């Protein structure tokens, strides 16, 4: 991805986006109880913790584009992955407006708490001023869609979230795009059935984990990925995507039955128009993280990429024996024979991708079930029921999270969520977590689950059939 044109918003009539410059994250009541090194990401140029130029850092992931045609390797990769998706019978029929907006099986209701994007943010019009959970009203939305139309600019925000000491110092804060409510809606109508099918079918057929429930999904992963594991990381995946990968994504959707006109929304994601504060700019390539379906599309593209690299490096590869599960850039895969990921990384580099060893490793080492992580979680077989696998979020991560809050009024939900993550670390670690939480008065005002209850409910969850 690359920035192709920048201008002062006022020269083109756009008002300045008044995006918050102060973090909503504050130290929580548990900040002193637990240890941690993460702090809120830098959100403004003047941050005294900066040790690099902010604006440069944030836009630096737009490393450029490789200007290539869709090659032979890509074509076979698309064909192989389209073959899997075909077995899913994804309907390319538009999703009915109400289903797209207010919720349906496999596609949660449009989040009414996130930004409505442009022009709404400039007019003080919030999603809630247009939409109604209670009434499922669509009259106002339609007025809005007709009045303002589609293909509106995206609003660029700096993601307000915890980051490592090093990422704070380097101003390496993440940018997310707020698609206009009009474009979000039109995209959910166009691809909603694909979103639903993906959400209902995490695994090796969609090659996606988007929308999965790790508590349940983890036990399936080693059944699905039964060869020698393959895993590696990308650096700035989203912004590194060149247009060629979107071209591949468009071919893939066409094989699925989408018309050329329907894939036009992919051009909207690729060659994009943004507002960042007082600037207005155009980008060619790069997935604009935050728009409708970005995790799904990123995941689909990853399926094309990895197959492409294997086909390129290993001419004798048999893709029918390759398996992978992606969540955007995050991947866990397997092949029955050992595969040299450093080789795949060099191939990727020729395609404008930056792949590094898994988990900040120095060498493309062997990935084992002991060291493998996915969605930041390790895999640990239950001691009593070996076929059940615990998703293990490191206690360090749980500690980082508990020390800060964006709204202390949600302490109960926040802590409960962390408890659902923590117990997988074991009874001793859990009792210690709980003891430390209760070492401050707020901790004793909370309804915290008992370990035995967590374990029991986890074991019972595997009893209830799940719709696919």
């Amino acid at each position: 991805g690359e920035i192709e044109f920048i201008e002062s918003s006022k020269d083109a009539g756009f008002p300045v986006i008044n995006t918050p410059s102060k973090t909503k994250l504050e130290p929580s009541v548990f900040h002193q109880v637990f240890e941690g090194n993460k702090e809120p990401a830098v959100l403004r140029s003047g941050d005294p913790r900066l040790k690099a130029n902010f604006e440069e850092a944030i836009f630096s992931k737009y490393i450029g584009n490789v200007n290539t045609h869709v090659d032979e390797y890509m074509l076979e990769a698309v064909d192989h992955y389209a073959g899997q998706l075909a077995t899913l019978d994804i309907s390319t029929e538009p999703m009915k407006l109400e289903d797209a907006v207010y919720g349906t099986e496999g596609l949660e209701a449009l989040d009414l708490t996130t930004s409505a994007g442009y022009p709404y943010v400039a007019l003080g019009i919030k999603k809630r001023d247009i939409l109604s959970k209670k009434t499922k009203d669509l009259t106002k939305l339609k007025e809005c869609m007709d009045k303002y139309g589609l293909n509106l600019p995206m609003v660029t925000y700096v993601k307000d979230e915890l980051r490592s000491i090093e990422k704070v110092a380097k101003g390496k804060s993440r940018l997310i795009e707020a698609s206009s409510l009009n474009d979000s809606v039109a995209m959910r109508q166009t691809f909603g059935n694909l979103y639903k099918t993906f959400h209902l079918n995490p695994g090796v057929v969609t090659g996606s984990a988007v929308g999965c429930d790790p508590d349940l999904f983890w036990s399936k992963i080693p059944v699905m990925l039964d060869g020698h594991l393959i895993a590696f990381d990308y650096s700035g995946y989203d912004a590194s995507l060149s247009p060629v990968w979107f071209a591949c994504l468009k071919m893939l959707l066409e094989k699925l039955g989408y018309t050329h006109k329907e894939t036009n929304y992919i051009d909207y994601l690729c060659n994009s128009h943004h507002l960042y504060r007082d600037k207005h700019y155009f980008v060619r390539g790069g997935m604009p993280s935050g728009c409708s379906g970005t995790s799904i599309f990123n995941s689909m593209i990853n399926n094309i990429i990895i197959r492409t690299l294997m086909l390129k490096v290993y001419k004798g590869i048999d893709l029918d024996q390759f398996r992978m599960i992606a969540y955007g850039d995050d991947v866990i895969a397997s092949y029955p024979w050992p595969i040299d990921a450093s080789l795949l990384a060099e191939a990727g580099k020729g395609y404008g991708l930056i792949m590094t060893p898994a988990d900040k490793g120095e060498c493309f080492n062997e990935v084992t079930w002991t060291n493998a992580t996915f969605l930041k979680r390790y895999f640990r077989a239950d001691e009593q029921y070996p076929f059940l696998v615990h998703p293990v979020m490191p206690m360090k991560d749980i500690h980082e999270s508990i020390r800060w809050t964006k709204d202390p009024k949600n302490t109960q939900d926040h802590v409960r969520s962390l408890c659902l993550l923590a117990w997988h670390n074991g009874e001793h670690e859990y009792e210690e977590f709980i003891r430390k939480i209760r070492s401050v008065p707020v901790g004793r005002c909370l309804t915290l689950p008992a370990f035995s209850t967590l374990r029991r409910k986890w074991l019972d969850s595997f009893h209830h059939h799940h719709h696919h």
Binding site: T368, R380, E383, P386, H390
Partner: peptide, 9 residues
């Protein structure tokens, strides 16, 4: 996979 007792996190 590894079991918790055999491997920690």
């Amino acid at each position: 996979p590894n079991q918790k007792p055999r491997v920690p996190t």
